[PDB]
Amino acid sequence: VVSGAKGSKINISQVIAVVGQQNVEGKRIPFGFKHRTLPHFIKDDYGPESRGFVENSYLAGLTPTEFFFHAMGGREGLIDTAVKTAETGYIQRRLI
Amino acid sequence: DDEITPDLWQEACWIVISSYFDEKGLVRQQLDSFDEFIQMSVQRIVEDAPPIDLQPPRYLLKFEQIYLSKPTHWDGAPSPMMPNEARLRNLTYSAPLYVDITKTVQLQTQHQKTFIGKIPIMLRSTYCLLNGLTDRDLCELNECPLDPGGYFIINGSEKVLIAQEKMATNTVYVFAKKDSKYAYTGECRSCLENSSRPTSTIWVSMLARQRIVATLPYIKQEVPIIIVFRALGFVSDRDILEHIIYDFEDPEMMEMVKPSLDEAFVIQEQNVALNFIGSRGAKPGVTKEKRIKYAKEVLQKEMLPHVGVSDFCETKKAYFLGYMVHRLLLAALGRRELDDRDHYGNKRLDLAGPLLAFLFRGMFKNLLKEVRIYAQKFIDRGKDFNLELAIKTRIISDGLKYSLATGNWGDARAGVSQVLNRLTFASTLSHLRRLNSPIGRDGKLAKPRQLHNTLWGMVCPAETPEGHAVGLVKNLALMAYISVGSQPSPILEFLEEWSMENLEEISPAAIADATKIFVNGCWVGIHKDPEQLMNTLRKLRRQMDIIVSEVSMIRDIREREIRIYTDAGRICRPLLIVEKQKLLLKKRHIDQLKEREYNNYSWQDLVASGVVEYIDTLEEETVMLAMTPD
Amino acid sequence: MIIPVRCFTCGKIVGNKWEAYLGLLQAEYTEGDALDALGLKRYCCRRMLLAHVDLIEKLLNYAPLEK
DNA sequence: AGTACCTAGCTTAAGCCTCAATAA
RNA sequence: UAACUAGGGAACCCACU
DNA sequence: TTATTGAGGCTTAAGCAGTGGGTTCCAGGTACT
Numbered sequence A: 001v002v003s004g005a006k007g008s009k010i011n012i013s014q015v016i017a018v019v020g021q022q023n024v025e026g027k028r029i030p031f032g033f034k035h036r037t038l039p040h041f042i043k044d045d046y047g048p049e050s051r052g053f054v055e056n057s058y059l060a061g062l063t064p065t066e067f068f069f070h071a072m073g074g075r076e077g078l079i080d081t082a083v084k085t086a087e088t089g090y091i092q093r094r095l096i
Numbered sequence B: 001d002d003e004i005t006p007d008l009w010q011e012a013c014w015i016v017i018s019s020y021f022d023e024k025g026l027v028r029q030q031l032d033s034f035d036e037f038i039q040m041s042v043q044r045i046v047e048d049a050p051p052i053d054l055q056p057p058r059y060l061l062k063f064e065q066i067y068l069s070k071p072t073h074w075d076g077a078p079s080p081m082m083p084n085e086a087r088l089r090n091l092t093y094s095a096p097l098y099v100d101i102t103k104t105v106q107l108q109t110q111h112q113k114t115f116i117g118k119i120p121i122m123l124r125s126t127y128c129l130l131n132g133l134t135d136r137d138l139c140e141l142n143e144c145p146l147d148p149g150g151y152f153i154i155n156g157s158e159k160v161l162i163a164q165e166k167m168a169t170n171t172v173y174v175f176a177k178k179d180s181k182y183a184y185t186g187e188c189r190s191c192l193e194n195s196s197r198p199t200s201t202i203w204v205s206m207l208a209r210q211r212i213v214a215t216l217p218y219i220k221q222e223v224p225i226i227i228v229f230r231a232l233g234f235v236s237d238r239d240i241l242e243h244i245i246y247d248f249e250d251p252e253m254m255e256m257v258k259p260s261l262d263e264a265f266v267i268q269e270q271n272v273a274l275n276f277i278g279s280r281g282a283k284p285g286v287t288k289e290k291r292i293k294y295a296k297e298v299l300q301k302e303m304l305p306h307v308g309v310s311d312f313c314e315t316k317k318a319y320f321l322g323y324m325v326h327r328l329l330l331a332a333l334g335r336r337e338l339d340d341r342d343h344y345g346n347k348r349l350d351l352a353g354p355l356l357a358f359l360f361r362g363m364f365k366n367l368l369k370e371v372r373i374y375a376q377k378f379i380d381r382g383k384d385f386n387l388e389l390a391i392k393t394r395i396i397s398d399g400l401k402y403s404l405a406t407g408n409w410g411d412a413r414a415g416v417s418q419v420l421n422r423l424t425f426a427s428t429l430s431h432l433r434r435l436n437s438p439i440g441r442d443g444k445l446a447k448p449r450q451l452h453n454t455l456w457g458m459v460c461p462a463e464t465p466e467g468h469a470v471g472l473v474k475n476l477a478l479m480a481y482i483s484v485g486s487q488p489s490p491i492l493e494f495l496e497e498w499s500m501e502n503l504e505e506i507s508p509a510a511i512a513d514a515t516k517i518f519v520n521g522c523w524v525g526i527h528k529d530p531e532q533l534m535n536t537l538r539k540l541r542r543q544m545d546i547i548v549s550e551v552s553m554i555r556d557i558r559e560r561e562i563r564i565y566t567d568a569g570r571i572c573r574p575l576l577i578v579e580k581q582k583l584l585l586k587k588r589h590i591d592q593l594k595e596r597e598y599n600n601y602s603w604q605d606l607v608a609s610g611v612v613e614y615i616d617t618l619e620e621e622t623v624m625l626a627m628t629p630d
Numbered sequence C: 001m002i003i004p005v006r007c008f009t010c011g012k013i014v015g016n017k018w019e020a021y022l023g024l025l026q027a028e029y030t031e032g033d034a035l036d037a038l039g040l041k042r043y044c045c046r047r048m049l050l051a052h053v054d055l056i057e058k059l060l061n062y063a064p065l066e067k
Numbered sequence D: 001a002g003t004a005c006c007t008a009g010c011t012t013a014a015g016c017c018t019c020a021a022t023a024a
Numbered sequence E: 001u002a003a004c005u006a007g008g009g010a011a012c013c014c015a016c017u
Numbered sequence F: 001t002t003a004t005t006g007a008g009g010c011t012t013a014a015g016c017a018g019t020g021g022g023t024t025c026c027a028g029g030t031a032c033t
């Protein structure tokens, strides 16, 4: 990290201390079920672990709810990458 | 004392999972769907086709019984064809389809077991030649015992039907259209199952400004809902509003139904409403009675076929239309949340069975059409015609083979059938457990590509392509099962036996306090004690009674509804049953499952004990679920 | 499909030890004790036997095309 | 028989419709 | 008494950066 | 008073990053001898 070759301080913090809050479209994990993020929670649960705060590190290991919410965040990243390339190509061609 | 202690829990749960995979395997969805198709859907399509008639001497032909042989190859004597021989010789692994036709003119004759076409057989299904063979017998046929089957051999090429994901039928959904002329729109893709006409979608929308309007099938221009209600035979306002609003002590719904009644002030007679809704049809009527008869036919057939397609069912159809308007009003009032399109309880998976049944419906309609053509050509000369000459097995065999080979579905959509990936065994299993969303891949809408919450335990959250099909091509989770479909009839006789009053036998004043009951999306009546009814339905499902294990029974509690789902395409997974903070699974079940090959205790015995049950996505809404017994 | 003649990492002969490993396993040895009895001390040689899958016995279930 | 041959969603420019000053 | 080339299209699917 | 010529609201094309590999398909239908 301090050579600048690879990684960041955020990566070290995620590996060692805590992964953090998983987000979908800038908000926390939505109530995809009826007022629940998952059927393992009570209804109208607005706490950290219910709405996508991964309290474990990557070394400690994600709990299954945290695993699913992290999968949601990674899926959002992959979607953004694909639509980003597909949209920027046409802008490049029009500009040239 | 019989509880699994936490130090034994890992061993116990993995014995349960091992029993599940020993009983089931990994391709039950393909094999079960194709087996259901061959066993029931082919006969249902053949019998459901109308008795063809030509006229003068007038005769008619009827198809009564479907016979399927084992996969066979022929010029010479017919011989059984092993799938490896079909792989090597670039043949199609198919079985002959035989029907018996009656010809009544009157003189009645029996053309027993005439050949009408060849149906490709999915490997390791109940009608494949490898069904029930041992590992040694599979190796004698140069077949891999570890091969799961679940695919077709078409011209020597292994073809896998990718499961197609679609919006669930017969269910009312209310969405919001952004910056459209309609603020809130209702929607019901109505389809009478086991007949499966091209499905009819009705929209009950409300204009933005607040009049409620109905978009009808085979009518071009939008139709006010009160005109539709008066066209059903309810020329009043107490009748229509009793069908729509079940509670007269709520005046806000009365305010929101003010403008529809005000705009429908012109028409107060039934036949005037029929003329109004028939003047705007796809085929305009020449005269008034033609318009009235056309609109009557539209209301009887095209409008809500799943609640009823025959005559004398206008009261049930009016109740369901009023339910649609009531859902629209509750959405506008805000008392009901807007429906989620990406919720997997609102979606069905078209497996090999339903897709081949759609193909078989189209091709049997075609085969009947050239039977009409041949009989009409040979009846103009007054001569009798041979049925063997009239039957064209070419079109059905080659159409089914062509759609399984190229993947183009219908005589529409492509990529339904794909060449099975045989690079590694994991790729073979993954391709056999693949789910496809038919949303166009050039769209930038992230919502169908996003990993929704309701994919827990049903669809893998990690396995997806990273290209243009990200989030659209999905993969089935390991113990996730897709419901194969069943008849809703025994649940209906049990319900009418269990103090549930039908819709046609109640006053509309009793709707407000009771719980509406929907069976496969059809409102069948109301029940005044929903909690003991749901307990009884659960007890029947846990005991492997007349309710089969794949039937979904959902009780919405905040708004009084009980929905029972029996149709195919529902994705479900087994869950242990917890009662009074204790697992119903005890140490004796694990002990019996340990000697699984000795006492013949299996996964089915674990289901039949009321220990595990299959919960789909809609029922998972109402489930309070523990991750671990800890 | 069949046991490699040598360990990939170091080159110790392991092709003569698969049948002896199977004989020790059916003699109610643990896998670690069976590896220790065959003289496989380095873990590079140990996972040649520990992780091996004998596909050749499944291949022999099919009759040869000529005989 | 072999075969001749005769026939899902977006944004935006462009084209097309009804209502108001104004002279006849 | 070395006689010297390649071939179409339309759709779909998959993979890759 | 009244046509008359000017300016605000409706449909419909035209677009929509690249590189390989594989698969299927590009025609039956009666006459007639």
Ligand SMILES: [Zn+2]
Pocket (backbone or CB within 6 Å): C007, C008, C009, C010, C011, C012, C042, C043, C044, C045, C046
């Ligand atoms: Zn070594």
